[PDB]
């Protein structure tokens, strides 16, 4: 229930990472019915989205940073489930459902 | 005779060096001893001597279509710097 | 995320030229170079869509260069440090206003 103490070491922190991954990913069928995503995106694509967010932070070595990231992850998850703000092609922070990149930016504006 | 043909082989020569660092000492002696003769035999060739406070000694040549070749001049003696220039002039030009 | 990769400048604002008092120097600020503003076409008011349009001058201040530098790298902002220019105190004399021109040459 309560906010746990900071994880002592990386084994403790990574153990907490897997519980968050399990809890966040287990709630995909609830999210699918809440946002009516049956004809929009497959459950696996949102599972791979969560895994990708976790992998993008695999380089963090401070257990206290990991604890804060998990806590913010639980809060992001809770707001998505409990108080849904349904857009069309996003949930929360994540989008759902011959020239280099300089000319495209150049044609758009002067601020890159 | 190649020292009279740098105008016909490359469009521009650049020598980068440090004003005081010992690593740039051979390059400075090379500039102080050879620039007078090189410019005299190649009056229409820009030989740009650009000194900076913390750069490794370098040499650059600019041929056709802005194609460029560079040589690291660190750990070289002054006759070897003269040799590296002759390779730049005679090859790739 | 997207706002964390902007380039900033860490700098100490110089003294103004319209006042001889020096009681604002020593401060260090992070310039967010927010230079995207335009005119609203109903009144001509200055419109902007940059969240960091005024935070760098209003609220974000640092008492030292090191403090400003450490905060930028913790936030991920790529910064450049501009050292401030300082005056050179030179010897002045009221007596110099009456210096002898010397023997008529």
């Amino acid at each position: 229930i309560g906010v746990p103490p900071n994880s002592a070491n990386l084994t403790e922190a990574r153990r907490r990472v897997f519980d968050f991954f399990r809890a966040a990913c287990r709630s995909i069928p609830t999210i699918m019915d809440i946002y009516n995503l049956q004809d929009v995106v497959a459950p696996s694509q949102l599972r791979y989205a969560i895994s990708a967010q976790i992998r993008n932070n695999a380089h963090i070595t401070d257990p206290k940073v990991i604890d804060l990231l998990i806590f913010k992850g639980m809060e992001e998850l809770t707001d998505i489930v409990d108080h849904a703000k349904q857009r069309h092609h996003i949930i929360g922070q994540y989008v759902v459902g011959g020239k280099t990149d300089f000319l495209k930016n150049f044609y758009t504006s002067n601020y890159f | 005779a190649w020292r009279g043909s740098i105008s016909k082989s490359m469009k521009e020569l650049r020598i980068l060096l440090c004003q005081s660092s010992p690593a740039s000492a051979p390059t400075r002696t090379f500039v102080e001893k050879n620039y007078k003769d090189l410019k005299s035999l190649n009056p229409k060739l820009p030989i740009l001597i650009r000194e900076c406070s913390g750069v490794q000694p370098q040499m650059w040549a600019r041929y056709d279509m802005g194609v460029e070749r560079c040589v690291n001049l660190d750990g070289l003696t002054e006759p070897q710097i003269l040799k590296a220039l002759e390779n730049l002039v005679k090859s790739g030009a | 995320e997207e706002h964390l990769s902007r380039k900033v400048i860490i700098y100490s604002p110089a003294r103004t030229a319209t006042q001889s008092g020096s009681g604002k120097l020593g401060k260090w600020k992070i310039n967010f170079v927010s230079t995207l503003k335009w005119e609203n076409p109903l009144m001509g008011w200055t419109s902007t869509g940059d969240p960091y349009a005024n935070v760098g001058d209003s609220a974000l201040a640092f008492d030292s260069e090191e403090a400003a530098k450490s905060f930028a790298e913790r936030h991920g902002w790529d910064y450049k440090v501009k050292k401030p220019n300082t005056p050179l105190l030179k010897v002045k004399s009221y007596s110099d206003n009456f210096k002898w021109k010397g023997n008529p040459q």
Binding site: - | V31, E51 | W38, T46, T86
Partner: protein
Amino acid sequence: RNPVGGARVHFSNPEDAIEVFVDGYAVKVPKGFTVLQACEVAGVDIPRFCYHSRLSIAGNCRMCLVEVEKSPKPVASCAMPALPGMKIKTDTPIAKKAREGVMEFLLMNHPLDCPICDQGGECDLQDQSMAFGSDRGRFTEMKRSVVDKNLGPLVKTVMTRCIQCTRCVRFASEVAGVQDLGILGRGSGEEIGTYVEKLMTSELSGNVIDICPVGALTSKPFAFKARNWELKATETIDVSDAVGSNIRVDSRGPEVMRIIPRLNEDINEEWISDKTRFCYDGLKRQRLSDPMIRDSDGRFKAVSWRDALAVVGDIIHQVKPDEIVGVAGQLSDAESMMVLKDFVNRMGSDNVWCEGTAAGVDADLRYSYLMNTSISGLENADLFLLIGTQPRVEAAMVNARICKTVRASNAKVGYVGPPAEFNYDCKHLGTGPDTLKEIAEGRHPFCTALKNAKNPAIIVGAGLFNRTDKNAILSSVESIAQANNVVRPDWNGLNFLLQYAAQAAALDLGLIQQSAKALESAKFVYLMGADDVNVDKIPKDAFVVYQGHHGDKAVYRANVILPASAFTEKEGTYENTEGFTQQTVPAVPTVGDARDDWKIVRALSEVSGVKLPYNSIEGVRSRIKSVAPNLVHTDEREPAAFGPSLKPECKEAMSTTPFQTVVENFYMTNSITRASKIMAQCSAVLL
């Protein structure tokens, strides 16, 4: 304790230091410092009105009074020399009450017009009244009043506010070098003025606005436009010339409101020229905002960036490589010039240079086109020899340093060139190169004075670099330099004064005109802000592309117009005449659909089929590191590593043509100033 404003103190010798006490605390100051300066070292801010660190001491406002032990009277700290064992008290009841009394006298006749006075919000008198003399007013008689005076279109006058500090009078006689302002009359009815009707014609006249502590002398074009608290301050540099004066750009929204000097002891010393201060008006006028290709009826039509770039790229491949020519403008940044040179070189062309007299010069050795003595080092010269240069109109802040040295050190000035008006005494030695032969062969009163000078200084204008006999002239100049021992390991007195902000970086990067007639045989011309080139030499059938933010004649000839950002709207690299490299800082957004200059060239190169190895400005600067590494080592002072000995011997015969004048109109020098209402007014009356 930290000195006030972080002021640096330099000691000639530790033995030449004395000890003083400021409010008990102990400080070590050089011999000759005044009591006020010792207070500054001790981190104590003494109020002052008439004292200015760059002007002679006056001691008339009496606001700097402090208590000195064993002294019967309060001491004017700005004027009194500090002595060993001196005990200085700045917050005792005598000092506090003396300040209160003087402040009451200052406000006695001062007009009640803070709401209509532009100094409000940045006024020393308001602040020192708040802090020191917090005395309720008890003056109930009639105030004096003064009529206003006309000093020209730049300086607005409200003389009721004047507190007779005489800073403006002393500036006119010690810095500006033009004695027009004086103090007329006697008593409380003394008035600052010119007596006869006349306008301030000095190019440094706008600095009296900064030094006037009250709203008596204010900027006329800025009048009533804004309050200081609503202005955003940007710390940048000036591009009006090759001096790189440090400035502060004040803006409100997407508009520059005013430009004021910024402290830089080595360059401009908190002064700027009138062109630098009053050219900001042209930044919002006649701006190129959209890409534009001329239509069938020979009239321009706005298009997108894609359509405009395709038109230029499509036609660049229908011309021979040797017929491609690119000219960089006088306001071009180092990044844009490097990309221009890279693009032109990969299009098989070798014709890229910077507009101006120094277009086809020998840039091999950096000494040959830089002020090697340095602006701050000019103060150590006991003799100036100016050859073919008018510094007063070419580099005003450099000329200011020379005047300052002549008044203080009694240095002598020899001038060779067309007749010109100098703001300091100077012997006119001649107008053409025959004097250089005359100087070289000796037998002249100035020839022996040059030989008798300990640290001589020769300054040669860049306007003598487009002459037919530049080599012969520079050969003669070096012979005079070597003969008189002008260049030594302890003193480098040979200088070359460039005229354009872009020239120093262009020569470092390699932008040298090879073919003297490459323009008259061009089929593709890329004008990167080069509005000052003569465009009649371009063949009538040659594709011309103009990229810039303004334009008068090149816009008329261009087939395609590419709008570009100005120096107040981007981060660019600029090098001044002394090899000092600095960077601008963006202050306001760009106007219309304009783009940064290097972005247009990099974008146009990809459209033309050339791949450059950079996408961001950081890639361009790393590329510049391979060419001119000093261009990316910003804000670093570096001595020259090689000298005139490496120059080949030259045997050309000198011509007889007298030297010409480079800058005909000081106020109309670039495309920004030519789009300025104020610079137009100055050319009408101030010239």
